[PDB]
């Protein structure tokens, strides 16, 4: 569980929740995925600001699977690790 | 080439190549936050918040002792950066 390792999920201007993705036919069986709490980002006054967006940061990771559902197959999956705040103006 | 959030984020980052011939994958791209603060509404680095790396625990392959035997090692990699504040709302 990443909640016990880091609390950036609660302190970020683009906070997130962690959801357990369970699969017995896959190794690791449990994968924790970040889901952005808001569409906007939290501003200085504590309000959800829609001049920016919370977006998930994804990582391509290889996983082990039992196929057909002796043999194992290495499968590529995309996982959300956390969220960042993006703006339409690049400085 | 897959995502440009590194340039559009209020906590932007650069990607650095971590090379290791005794590890598979040999090359791992790691995020390094560009600034200590975060980019505010006016385009300035704001030090009332901090850019922090989001790290992921990932398994890698290593040659141990340093051609026949390998070890599966859990490593920590920075995937990107987020902006944190000292006031939680």
């Amino acid at each position: 569980n990443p909640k016990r390792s880091s609390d950036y999920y609660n302190r970020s201007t683009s906070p997130w929740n962690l959801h357990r993705n369970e699969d017995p036919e896959r190794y690791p069986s449990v994968i924790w995925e970040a889901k952005c709490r808001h569409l906007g980002c939290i501003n200085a006054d504590g309000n959800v600001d829609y001049h920016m967006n919370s977006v998930p940061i994804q990582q391509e990771i290889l996983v082990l699977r039992r196929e057909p559902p002796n043999s194992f197959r290495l499968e590529k999956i995309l996982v959300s690790v956390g969220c960042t705040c993006v703006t339409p103006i690049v400085h | 080439r897959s995502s440009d959030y590194y340039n559009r984020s209020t906590s932007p980052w650069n990607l650095h190549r971590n090379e290791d011939p005794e590890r598979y994958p040999s090359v791992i791209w790691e995020a390094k936050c560009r600034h200590l603060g975060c980019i505010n509404a006016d385009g300035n680095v704001d030090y009332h918040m901090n850019s922090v790396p989001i790290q992921q625990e990932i398994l890698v392959l290593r040659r141990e002792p340093p051609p026949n035997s390998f070890r599966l090692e859990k490593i920590l990699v920075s995937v990107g950066c987020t902006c944190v504040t000292p006031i939680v709302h």
């Binding site: 190794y27 069986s29 082990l64 | 026949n68 035997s69 390998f70 599966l72």
Partner: peptide
């Protein structure tokens, strides 16, 4: 060929 694997991975294989 020797591949050092954790206890949880082998338990999942069998």
């Amino acid at each position: 060929i020797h591949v050092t694997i954790p206890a949880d991975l082998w338990d999942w294989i069998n």
